[PDB]
From a paper:
The self-labeling protein tags (SLPs) [name], [name]-tag, and [name]-tag allow the covalent labeling of fusion proteins with synthetic molecules for applications in bioimaging and biotechnology. The three most popular SLPs are [name] (HT7),14 [name]-tag ([name]),15 and [name]-tag ([name])16. To guide the selection of an SLP–substrate pair and provide guidelines for the design of substrates, we report a systematic and comparative study of the labeling kinetics and substrate specificities of [name], [name]-tag, and [name]-tag. We complement these kinetic studies by reporting crystal structures of HT7 and [name] covalently labeled with rhodamine-based fluorophores, providing a detailed understanding of their substrate preferences.
After reaction, the PEG-alkane ligand is buried in the protein, while the xanthene moiety of the dye lays on the distorted α-helix 8 (Hlx8) in a conformation partially constrained by the crystal packing. The alkane-fluorophore is positioned by the Hlx6–turn–Hlx7–turn–Hlx8 motif of the HT7 capping domain from which T172Hlx8 and, to a lesser extent, T148Hlx6 form hydrogen bonds with the oxygen and the nitrogen of the amide bond linking PEG-alkane and fluorophore. CA-TMR and CA-CPY have similar conformations in both structures with only minor differences in their torsion angles. In comparison to TMR, one of the additional methyl groups of CPY is forming van der Waals interactions at the protein surface, potentially explaining the increased affinity of CA-CPY relative to that of CA-TMR. The mechanism underlying the equilibrium shift from the spirocyclic nonfluorescent to the zwitterionic fluorescent form is not yet fully understood, but our results indicate that the planar, zwitterionic form of rhodamines (e.g., TMR and CPY) features energetically favorable interactions with the HT7 surface, thus potentially favoring this state of the fluorophore when attached to the protein.
Author numbering: 3 to 295
Write the structure that this text describes.
Amino acid sequence: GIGTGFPFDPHYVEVLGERMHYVDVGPRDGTPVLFLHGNPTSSYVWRNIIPHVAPTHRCIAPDLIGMGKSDKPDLGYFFDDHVRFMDAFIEALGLEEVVLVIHDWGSALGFHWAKRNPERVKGIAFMEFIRPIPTWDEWPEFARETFQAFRTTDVGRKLIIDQNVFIEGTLPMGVVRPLTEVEMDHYREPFLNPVDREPLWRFPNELPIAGEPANIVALVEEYMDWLHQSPVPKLLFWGTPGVLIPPAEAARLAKSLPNCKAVDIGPGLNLLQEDNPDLIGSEIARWLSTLEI
Ligand SMILES: [Cl-]
């Protein structure tokens, strides 16, 4: 079925004194497509979408600082930490104009960068992105208790850091189809050492849920407003029931956002890339052929 291997040559770039691993494939002459993963994934999540796009466009898929095959310094791994490291990563590869393909926390990165560099973003494909969740009722009920547990300095760290629940439990619960043992091992590899699991816990404590953290809420609201006011070509993927984006919200945004094409990928939760990579890749490639890049 959905291939579990990772047939990509490892690329490394030094960013603020640390090395960041990244996938780099495709032609070098045009505009490149930058793939940003989230929590608790790596560039491995893009492994079955990239081969659809590589024939025609450059694919760049970094592992976030502290995750995947990137270096893992002793940082707090707040959202701002990733913002600094991703700005410096984009400048280290001398990328001028890019097309964004962003998911989960990568979306919060991508969108934020796009707000600060409007002339440099030729297109944004996004899925299960970070939006402001006004109350806990807008969070899916089946996960509502668990993320509330995750957002505590005592119980949450025992779950995510000591017992590694975000990798062993939450991650498969974010995919409709079952993850194979090879896939689980690939996702487990960067966090075999518990001390390296700080990012797995800080991200859910950065989620803009119920107005906290206030700075993250403001930051996210700002680029959501910028998105509602930008003419950038937009491609939005959504699934049922979803996690961050329920179908109702996706439908709303499909009309409220300028130049927005929506694509229903079928059953999905949060890692839509794992439930229907074929459709996402084919749609991204066809969408890319319609841009002026
Ligand atoms: Cl999270």
